[PDB]
């Protein structure tokens, strides 16, 4: 019953041989779970180091001492490129999994991972690539963010084999190295960000089902702002239609929204974008419906001890029927989780309790939920004279103490956009660790964090372990 609310815990960790030797400055920069397996299949993720792609499958176990992580394919980039970015795709003919790997020479390598061969290379960027993402609407469409300050959109569909760059996000919207690229779930809006502290939202056209001699070039993003953060931005993503983004020296993940943006509206076209007619405007928006405001900061998840580190990435688990979980690892050996559904449940609990405090002038009894006891059996143990409020079990103390309320508000109060929401679970990592990337399995029972020293931390929830097996 309470299973819906369980957060992960450390289940397995491994260190991969140093492959950038110095003999400790190698890191895993990326991890991604394969997203095209049938429901129920063993989840399979790839962890890309600077020279290797380690592909693992995770299988839950009844033995605490057993190892759920087994490595099924291990690939080395036999060339001179050091890598830091990956994303998954599929063969358009055979439907075999394709792992894309990109790095500092400026090329995307596409690997046929089950057969251990190169599918192809995507050549054309003018500098190192730092992020890749696949379109959730078309598994053959990939976006790449580069030091060359552009995004390129690539297609692996057969009709584009001879020239696979279908779109270039160029122009003047960005002026220095891009570190992050993300697709909206509709496949048509793209977010980009990097060293110039700009977050840009771009609207993709539909791409012809046929050979394109040249890419469609896009010269203006539809939303642009350098004012949501005050530092370099290294991670950006959509959460539905809201934006999550992270910047260096700020120790926060920011949740915010573009005013007037809705993915239910028709996709605007390229001649609808705003152009920079005023050079003192650091925000501009096609979407804007006294002076408006083109964005609104909503909340800040507190992400302490990232220091001056950057290129550190969060990941939200967002799946129908399950709770949305935000996970991020900092630079001082900590991994953070927030279950976004606790926010609504806390606010219901506080409105129910503040209500009974007036309606019964204080004679109010608080009973935990997740018991055999319901707001009915609890009411029969008293009557009409005293109010019974149901408190979520995961709401634990320290009437309730000042310090108990302040500790609950610190984790679940959403009333201040400039506040800091403390992580709902904070797990410590042995030794000195800097997180680079987080990935979730399809069913959300596994969460993998990878970072420096070629380390992977594998968290699990809903395990099936039963009673030791040494």
């Amino acid at each position: 019953d309470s299973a819906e609310w369980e957060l992960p815990r450390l289940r397995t960790s491994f260190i991969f041989q140093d492959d950038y030797k110095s003999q400790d400055l190698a890191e895993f920069f990326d991890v991604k779970f394969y997203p095209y397996s049938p429901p129920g299949a063993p989840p399979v993720f790839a962890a890309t180091s600077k020279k290797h792609a380690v592909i693992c499958r995770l299988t839950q176990t009844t033995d605490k001492d057993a190892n759920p992580c087994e490595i099924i394919q291990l690939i080395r980039d036999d060339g001179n490129e050091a890598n830091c970015a990956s994303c998954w795709s599929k063969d358009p003919i055979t439907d075999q999994p394709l792992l894309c790997i990109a790095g500092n020479e400026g090329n995307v390598k596409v690997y046929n991972v089950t057969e251990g061969k190169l599918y192809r290379t995507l050549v054309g960027h003018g500098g190192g690539i730092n992020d890749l993402a696949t379109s959730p609407a078309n598994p053959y469409i990939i976006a790449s963010a580069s030091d060359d300050t552009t995004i390129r959109i690539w297609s692996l569909a057969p009709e584009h084999e001879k020239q696979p760059c279908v779109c270039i996000l160029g122009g003047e919207g960005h002026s220095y190295d891009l570190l992050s690229v993300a697709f909206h779930d509709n496949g048509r809006y793209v977010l980009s960000a990097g060293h110039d502290q700009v977050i840009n939202l771009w609207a993709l056209p539909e791409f012809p089902n046929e050979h394109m001699e040249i890419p469609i070039v896009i010269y203006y993003p539809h939303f642009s702002s350098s004012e949501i953060h005050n530092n370099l931005v290294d991670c950006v993503a959509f959460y539905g239609d809201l934006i999550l983004s992270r910047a260096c020296h700020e120790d926060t993940i920011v949740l915010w929204r573009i005013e007037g943006f809705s993915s239910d509206d028709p996709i605007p076209g390229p001649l609808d974008a705003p152009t920079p007619t005023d050079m003192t405007k650091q925000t501009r928006s096609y979407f804007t419906p006294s002076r408006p405001a083109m964005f609104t900061r909503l909340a800040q998840f507190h992400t302490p001890d990232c220091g001056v580190q950057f290129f550190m990435r969060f990941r939200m688990y967002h799946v129908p029927g399950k709770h949305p979980i935000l996970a991020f690892a900092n630079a001082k050996s900590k991994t953070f989780f927030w279950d976004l559904a606790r926010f609504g449940e806390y606010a219901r609990f506080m409105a129910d309790l503040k209500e009974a405090q007036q309606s019964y002038n204080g004679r109010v009894v608080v009973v935990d939920q997740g018991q055999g006891i319901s707001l009915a059996q609890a009411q029969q143990v008293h009557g009409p004279g005293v109010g019974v409020v149901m408190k979520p079990a995961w709401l634990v103390p320290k009437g309730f103490s000042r310090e108990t309320l302040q500790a609950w508000a610190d984790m679940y109060d959403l009333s201040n956009p400039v506040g800091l929401i403390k992580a709902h679970r904070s797990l410590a990592i042995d030794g000195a660790f800097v997180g680079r990337q987080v990935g979730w399995s399809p069913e959300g029972e596994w969460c993998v964090v990878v970072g420096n020293g070629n380390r992977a931390l594998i968290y699990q929830r809903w395990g099936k372990e039963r009673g030791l097996g040494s």
């Binding site: 080395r76 070039v217 002076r291």
Partner: protein, 809 residues
């Protein structure tokens, strides 16, 4: 009832409590909505593609294969206690090599432009690792965001407090009267507020209430111990009727009626390219634009007066199909309808072969005898223009404008040909001769005199400095650098290209027309000094430079004989300081990559090809180059041409000696305390857009130029003027979108392009009356400058009369 600062402050604190409450409600609402809209997973395979693959861990019971180690620990419990020290396993490695090398490196998307474009000055907001201290950056942003949060609450709270005189408009009036609004506001701003608000604030109590409300708000919300804090003044500045007064995006007896009627067109209309937002003009430090327009040479009247005087100083056709007054003659008129015939009458002037009647009657849906009736009953009187007498002036010993010839000391007497040392000035618009005494800049602004050019109000009859073009003619090639003809080409001597209008003998008129760019027969004789206007480049191709550790180079794709024009260096035109900010914004050392070409050293204009430009930005440096750049004057634009100095065969890499053409601005600042084929070459060659590798003997890629992004910026630049009514913006934008695509540099081509516009947009022009009225103001302006022939106004009268007759449908 009777309030105090304390009582209202107290009340604001209680109202302020609804702000966090609403915020929590909103974020929770949006979080719930987003959770509900979670995406179903897509493109699932029907089988697990990894199902057949087993653990590659090596058994104690792999020879020659590379191997990597992995050490696993298992964890349990709440704090992640490890079960033991871990276990290590050996794994074979699959080594996969890439099949393709990256393209040479580059920064930004390099896009093609047909001509130079004019840039705005950017701010230095980011420097890879003049500027505002980041602390002020951070703090203003916090306050901006808080002000935006609080702004929507002020009217609801005012309505609930309901205090006499606490009105959004009375609070704006009080703010304007406080001393802070001298060190926040300048004259004409207070004048614009006083237009909408005035100074009376009501009763004594109304004035006392507003002052107490302001104090009480700045006490509650502007407590300076906080970073997040807003003064009420900062919220009122956001108000939709206050903000525009602090937005400087502003374009600007009988005759001053007309003057004001054509102000938009006299102010914005470009003299060179006839567009109202374009690439000419000057950008000031705050990015206000001085257009190269009639206002630069004194507005409407100095050119109009001269047209009138030209008209009476010439002393001595089919009637319109709109019930023409010429056959006949003699519904209430709007003031707009009357003004429309006012300015056509004045700008058509003392004409013989053109009368307002027919044309005004084509623009207004009125019959011609109707506007003749209104013409006669209004009896318009022109100012009488004095007989302009031209004072006899001694010719110059270094320049004869009748023989079109330079003579004797000429290179020492003028700086007309020395573009690097020239300072740019608005063309003559004075009365009297072009002398230092009359303040003529052409004569005296610089170290030496320069010739007066086509935009100066002087005439060649009057002015000994006036340029009249070259005298060259030949059934063969002419206007060459050292012509074997008897005397040389003054145009070439002055480092300018021939003028399609003044250079009547050499064929410039036809060869400077881009619509003949690829008539090889035409361009094989006649003037060979119009190549930048011709717009045709030798066939070139991008590739890997032959120089080691150089990135891209440019390669010839067709044989190039020495002396032939090769390509133009195009880019953004920027100021010195914008050049410096750019050298900073991109990083630094002499591993740098400059595309910053010096166009006019002394005036301070550089061409930056780092983002926008053309293939010429890829040409590398050699001391013994095979091409040579040269700054040319081209119809009052300065431009960079490349000419071959050797025979160059197809496949050879182009080089020139950079000289000091690409300066280090900041370092100099600190010191001042037959189809076309891909050629066979050794180097790889690339399509400039796809960076696809090109194969020898395939068609040379030649991609039409994409300008849509540039028409949109120029449209939006007109949309931004708060100075212009929507009817003005509608038409100006329609005309500019058409004329910007034709890249006009000479008035020789305007009548043909004008007639094409009135043909294509005829139906659109008569669909709505403001469009016809605006079209007539443009016509009146071009007629006033004697730049539109009277022949085309008569044809447009037919065209529109026939389009409106087709509308009666």
């Amino acid at each position: 009832t009777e309030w105090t600062v304390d009582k209202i402050a107290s009340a604001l604190s209680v109202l302020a409590e609804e702000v966090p409450q609403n915020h929590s409600r909103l974020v929770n609402f949006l979080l719930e909505e987003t959770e509900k809209r979670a995406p179903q997973p897509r493109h699932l395979s029907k089988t697990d593609p990894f199902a057949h693959m087993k653990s590659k861990a090596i058994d104690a019971n792999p020879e020659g294969v590379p191997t990597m180690d992995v050490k696993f620990k298992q964890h349990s419990g709440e704090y992640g206690k490890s079960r033991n020290s871990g276990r290590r396993f050996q794994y074979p490695v699959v080594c996969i090599k890439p099949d393709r090398e990256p393209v040479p490196p580059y920064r930004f998307h390099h896009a093609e432009i047909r001509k130079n474009i004019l840039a705005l000055n950017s701010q230095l907001n980011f420097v890879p690792h003049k500027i505002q201290p980041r602390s002020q950056k951070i703090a203003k942003r916090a306050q901006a965001e808080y002000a935006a949060t609080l702004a929507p609450y002020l009217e609801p709270w005012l309505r609930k407090l309901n205090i006499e005189g606490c009105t959004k408009s009375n609070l704006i009036r009080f703010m304007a009267s406080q001393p802070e609004s001298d060190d926040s506001m300048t004259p004409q701003q207070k004048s614009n507020l006083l237009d909408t608000y005035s100074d009376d604030m009501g009763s004594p109590q109304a004035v006392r209430n507003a002052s107490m409300f302001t104090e009480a708000w700045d006490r509650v919300f502007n407590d300076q111990s906080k970073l997040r804090r807003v003064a009420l003044r900062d919220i009122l500045m956001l108000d939709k009727n206050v903000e525009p007064i602090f937005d400087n995006k502003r374009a600007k007896a009988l005759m001053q009626k007309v003057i004001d009627a054509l102000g938009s067109y006299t102010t914005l209309g470009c003299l060179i390219c006839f567009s109202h937002d374009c690439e000419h003009g000057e950008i000031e430090r705050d990015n206000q634009k001085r257009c190269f327009s009639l206002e630069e040479i004194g507005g409407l009247m100095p050119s109009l007066r001269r047209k009138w005087a030209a008209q009476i100083e010439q002393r001595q056709h089919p009637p319109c199909r709109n019930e023409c007054y010429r056959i006949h003659g003699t519904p209430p008129w709007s003031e707009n309808e009357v003004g429309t015939l006012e300015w056509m009458f004045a700008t058509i002037g003392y004409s013989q072969t053109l009368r307002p009647e027919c044309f005004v009657g084509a623009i207004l849906g009125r019959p011609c005898w109707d506007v003749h009736r209104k013409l006669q009953e209004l009896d318009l009187r022109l100012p009488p223009v004095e007989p302009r007498t031209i004072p006899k002036q001694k010719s110059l010993p270094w320049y004869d404008r009748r023989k079109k010839q330079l003579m004797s000391d000429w290179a020492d007497a003028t700086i007309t040909h020395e573009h690097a040392v020239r300072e740019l000035f608005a063309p003559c618009h004075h009365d009297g001769p072009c002398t230092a005494a009359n303040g003529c800049p052409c004569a005296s602004a610089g170290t030496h005199p320069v010739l007066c050019e086509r935009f100066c109000l002087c005439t060649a009859e009057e002015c000994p400095l006036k340029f009249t073009g070259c005298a060259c003619h030949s059934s063969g090639k002419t206007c060459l650098q050292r012509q074997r003809e008897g005397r040389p080409c003054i145009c070439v001597q002055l480092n300018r290209e021939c003028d399609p209008t003044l250079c009547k003998g050499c064929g410039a008129r036809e060869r400077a027309d881009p619509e003949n760019a690829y008539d090889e027969v035409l361009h094989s004789t006649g003037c060979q000094n119009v190549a930048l206007q011709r717009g045709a480049a030798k066939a070139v191709v991008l590739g890997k430079s032959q120089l080691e550790a150089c990135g891209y180079g440019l390669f010839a794709a067709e044989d190039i004989e020495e002396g032939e024009f090769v390509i133009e260096y195009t880019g953004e035109l920027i100021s010195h300081d914008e050049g410096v900010r750019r050298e900073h914004r991109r990083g630094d050392e002499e591993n740098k990559v400059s595309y910053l070409f010096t166009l006019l050293e002394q005036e301070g204009i550089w061409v930056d090809a780092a983002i926008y430009g053309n293939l010429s930005r890829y040409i590398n440096h050699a001391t013994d180059g095979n091409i040579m750049p040269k700054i040319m004057y081209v119809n009052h634009e300065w431009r960079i041409k490349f000419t071959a100095i050797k025979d160059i065969k197809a496949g050879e890499e182009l080089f020139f000696n950079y000289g000091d053409n690409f300066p280090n601005l900041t370092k100099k600042l600190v010191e001042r305390n037959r189809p076309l084929l891909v050629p066979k070459t050794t180097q790889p060659l690339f399509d400039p857009l796809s960076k696809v590798q090109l194969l020898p003997g395939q068609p040379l890629p030649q991609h039409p130029i994409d300008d849509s992004w540039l028409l949109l910026k120029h449209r939006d630049n007109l949309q931004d003027f708060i100075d212009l009514r929507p009817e003005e913006k509608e038409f100006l934008q329609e005309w500019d979108a058409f004329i910007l695509r034709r890249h006009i540099s000479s008035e020789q081509y305007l009548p043909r392009y004008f007639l094409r516009f009135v043909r294509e947009k005829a139906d659109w022009l008569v669909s709505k009356r403001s469009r016809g009225e605006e079209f007539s103001k443009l016509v009146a302006t071009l007629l006033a400058r004697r730049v539109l022939p009277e022949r085309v106004v008569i044809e447009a009268t037919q065209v529109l009369n026939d389009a409106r007759g087709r509308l009666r449908e």
